[PDB]
């Protein structure tokens, strides 16, 4: 197989700066017709990958000139001069000079100014009690950087089990993440306690962000 190896895997970038991904194959991509068939595709969050550069360095219609391609030997490179919010995504590089194969990928990640998280809490909805479990959600919205720790305190004594956290992707218009902390206790459980409290602790602060409710 024609093995392609992209580097790096994750690459942070400040707006306006330059950005470079390297794609190198396990072998030459020189077609007999003297044409190297190396291409770069951009697949943004939840979308269909798109063609950006074809035949080593040719731009596809509609694709800005900020995107430049080049190659030499078995080493090819894509450059995103003047980065933008919309430019976030996994950049692909594929060869079709033989049995078509693709490259691992690279997650271009916009790196912006820190931002504090806005925290909201939600008590379970009666519509869920009959399931035998009650979920309490803590939602941190519009924060940056990606990192952050959340904590659940039930009637005071912190709780660690039953916690499941998942993050969104990088918003393409403010480049800020959001995430949700889901605490799922059993029906009888969630009912033997009256004060539910999550406490977020992001970099844009030291005193944690306390937000809670009482049944």
């Amino acid at each position: 197989d024609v093995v392609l190896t992209q580097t790096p895997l994750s690459l942070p970038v400040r707006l306006g700066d330059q950005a470079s991904i390297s794609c190198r194959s396990s072998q030459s991509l020189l077609h007999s017709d003297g044409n190297t068939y190396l291409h770069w595709y951009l697949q943004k969050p939840g979308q269909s990958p798109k063609l950006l550069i074809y035949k080593v360095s040719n731009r596809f219609s509609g694709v800005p000139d900020r995107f430049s391609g080049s190659g030499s030997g078995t080493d090819f490179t894509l450059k995103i001069s003047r980065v933008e919010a919309e430019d976030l995504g996994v950049y692909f590089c594929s060869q079709t000079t033989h049995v078509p194969t693709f490259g691992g990928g690279t997650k271009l990640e916009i790196k912006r100014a820190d931002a504090a998280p806005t925290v909201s809490i939600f008590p379970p909805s009666s519509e869920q009690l009959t399931s035998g479990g009650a979920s309490v959600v803590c939602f941190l919205n519009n924060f940056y950087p990606k990192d952050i720790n959340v904590k659940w305190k039930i009637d005071g004594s912190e709780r660690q089990n039953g916690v499941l956290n998942s993050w969104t992707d990088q918003d393409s218009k403010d480049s800020t993440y959001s995430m949700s902390s889901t605490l799922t206790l059993t029906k009888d459980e969630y009912e033997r306690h009256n004060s539910y409290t999550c406490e977020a602790t992001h970099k844009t602060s030291t005193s944690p962000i306390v937000k809670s409710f009482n049944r």
Binding site: I121, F122, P123, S125, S135, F213
Partner: peptide, 20 residues
Amino acid sequence: YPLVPGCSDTSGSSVTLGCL
């Protein structure tokens, strides 16, 4: 399931709802 405020004071952009 419905993710609705949980009865509180307006201090977080102006209302957030959800589906779990």
